Amino acid sequence: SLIDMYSEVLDVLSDYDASYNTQDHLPRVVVVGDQSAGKTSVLEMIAQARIFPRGSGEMMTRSPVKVTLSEGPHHVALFKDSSREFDLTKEEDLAALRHEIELRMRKNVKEGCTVSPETISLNVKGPGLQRMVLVDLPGVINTVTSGMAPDTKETIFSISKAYMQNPNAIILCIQDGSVDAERSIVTDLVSQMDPHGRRTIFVLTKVDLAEKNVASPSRIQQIIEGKLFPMKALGYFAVVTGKGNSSESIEAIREYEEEFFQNSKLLKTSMLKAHQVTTRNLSLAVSDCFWKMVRESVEQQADSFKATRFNLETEWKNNYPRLRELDRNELFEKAKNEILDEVIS
Amino acid sequence: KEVLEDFAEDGEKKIKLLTGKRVQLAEDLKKVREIQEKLDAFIEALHQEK
Amino acid sequence: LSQVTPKHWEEILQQSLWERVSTHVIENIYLPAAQTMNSGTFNTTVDIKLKQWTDKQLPNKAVEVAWETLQEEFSRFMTEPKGKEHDDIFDKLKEAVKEESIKRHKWNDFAEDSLRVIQHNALEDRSISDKQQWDAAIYFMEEALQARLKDTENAIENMVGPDWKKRWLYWKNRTQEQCVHNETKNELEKMLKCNEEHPAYLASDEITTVRKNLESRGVEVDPSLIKDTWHQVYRRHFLKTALNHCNLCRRGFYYYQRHFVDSELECNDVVLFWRIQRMLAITANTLRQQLTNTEVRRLEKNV
Amino acid sequence: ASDEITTVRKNLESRGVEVDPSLIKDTWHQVYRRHFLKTALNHCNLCRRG
């Protein structure tokens, strides 16, 4: 609905302005994750459909995907360059869509590289879906894979930094709950790049696995309440991505996560706030904050665009008052007609 | 007529041949106006929901 | 106070408002746009600058100017000495009430928004149908240019001094720095004479060429001083060039009457100044009517 | 020196003449040689009674 137009506006802005002079004035959602950190599961959980390719420890996400969640009569996903609709309600179409996405990732790869910086805009429709735009990025690997290009890690870092360059962009960090914050570089980079924390949001995965590992409650509470981390963010949320299997259904994972947290002793002991868990609470808070920032930003952009267009029109009148503006195609038609006239003359 | 049809099917040649202040002004105005129209529709639809 | 002829109010308001904004208009708008030789780009820059300034700053300045003029007449009438018959006991009470009334004064908030559109449409016209209006704009431009030229001459005279003929008559001797500035002036004179359409900005290699000629005269001058002298010289030269343009444009109304766009006598400046003069006349009349009607009741209420 | 060439070239442009730096260098070499020889001749006259 509304977010469909917002996504279209962003796409046209990127095409019109190759640089980020104007693209850095609108809010955005940036997602950065490590290897096997459940970044794909979290994005799939929000989209309520497993549309990304799955691999046994291999980084299937070889190209960034701009996944857009909108309001639609049916839960379907549509490519920007292709009109072939894919029904996410059927598992057979989901598998075909995953293969198509992987094929698009390989096609966009240039010569001499493994991961291409090009982003593919995907519109995932569905009734009741949150109206927001998500960005999928390749996982950050501590050790460079032998089968990948030597600059793949640098390309991933550059893409994440370019996305984070927008002062209104919302940071969505994804890591693993079984790995300490000192063993991951992504959390350090996020804290360094956002000293204020006015837009940083941290997402922790495999919370059930961490609890089954007998994690210290103090560390979990400090992470959620922002004590261990020097940065002071708006808030912290924890979600469960299941048991880690690549074939588990989304509905079973969500139901299991809700039951696990309902019967969890930590929540009933009031160690962690009840509204700081579950994906529904996080999605609602992110959507409301993102939409409010979009409303203010779009008003400023609309006034600026109107003024800019007025200046262009004024220049046209001053230079060419007795002429009409035509595009490249129309000028070609006018030119050929003049040629035919000269032939007759 | 044959030459024009071949030229019409190749937009790259048109871009190289059509370089001028008038051409750029028209193209930029079209793009800016198109973006502005989308922004107006987005703003109006957003504000009419409530 | 309301028994004064409207002409007196309009003359005071027009002169005060014009002098209040003349410096900002000429320096911040006219000068940057006049650098370009393209009339279309020149006009486009002027229109963009006008819209930006008018939509936010013009109503505030007009309100302050109108209120200040009302304050001058009102405060004076409170303290006008009526010869030897003037009483002094009431003067203390008059001043106390005057200060309190001024603090409680509050101009209409909707006047600023209404006037913004009013002068916007007034300035949007680009046709001069009256021959006398064209002549009036020329005279108005000449007076404004002469005032700016006199200030430029004063700064140049301070940096250099009187002419050798004049300094001999007055028995004044130039200082060493003054003579240095005079030599720099001669160098800039030759540079401007050769290239009559030199850009306002300077270049490093130009400074080196000027400095070497100064060394040929046994004078060492820092690049900063040369840049400052060049700025003043260019301003004076541009003002003189505009004056010559005014003389050429004096008989250009007939050419403009036939829309001789192809003719090189494109008196864009005269049209722009005429728009400003017309806008000032409308603004003065509108403020006079508002002062005579809108704010009299508020003044009475506060009293 | 290069800046000397620029100063000479600008004076030539003031006369409406465009000259390449190579030509200026060649002319300067011949002029300096002639000037130096004349200077030596003046030195000979002074050194006559030396």
Swiss-Prot record, chain A:
Binding site for GTP: 36, 38-41, 55, 206, 208, 241, 244-245
Impact noted for substituting residue 59 to A: Strongly decreased GTPase activity
Range of the intact protein held here: 263 to 607 of 960
Region (G5 motif): 239-242
Superkingdom to which the source organism belongs: Eukaryota
Region of interest: G4 motif: 205-208
Domain Dynamin-type G: 23-299
Effect listed in the UniProt record for changing residue 36 to A: Abolished GTPase activity without affecting the ability to bind membranes
Listed name of the protein: Dynamin-like GTPase OPA1, short form
Region feature G2 motif, mapped onto this chain: 59-62
Region annotation (G1 motif) ranges: 33-40
Originating organism: Homo sapiens
Function per UniProt: Constitutes the soluble short form (S-OPA1) generated by cleavage by OMA1, which plays a central role in mitochondrial inner membrane fusion and cristae morphology. The transmembrane long form (L-OPA1) and the S-OPA1 form higher-order helical assemblies that coordinate the fusion of mitochondrial inner membranes. Inner membrane-anchored L-OPA1 molecules initiate membrane remodeling by recruiting soluble S-OPA1 to rapidly polymerize into a flexible cylindrical scaffold encaging the mitochondrial inner membrane.
Annotated positions binding Mg(2+): 40, 61, 136
Cellular localization per UniProt: Mitochondrion intermembrane space
Outcome (variant: residue 295 to A): In interface mutant 9; strongly decreased ability to mediate mitochondrial fusion
Impact when changing residue 54 to A: Strongly decreased GTPase activity
Region of interest: G3 motif: 136-139
Curated annotation (Swiss-Prot), chain B:
Coiled-coil parts of chain: 1-50
Domain of life of the organism encoding this protein: Eukaryota
Compartment annotation: Mitochondrion intermembrane space
Biological role stated in the UniProt entry: Constitutes the soluble short form (S-OPA1) generated by cleavage by OMA1, which plays a central role in mitochondrial inner membrane fusion and cristae morphology. The transmembrane long form (L-OPA1) and the S-OPA1 form higher-order helical assemblies that coordinate the fusion of mitochondrial inner membranes. Inner membrane-anchored L-OPA1 molecules initiate membrane remodeling by recruiting soluble S-OPA1 to rapidly polymerize into a flexible cylindrical scaffold encaging the mitochondrial inner membrane.
Annotated protein name in UniProt: Dynamin-like GTPase OPA1, short form
Included stretch of the parent chain: 911 to 960 of 960
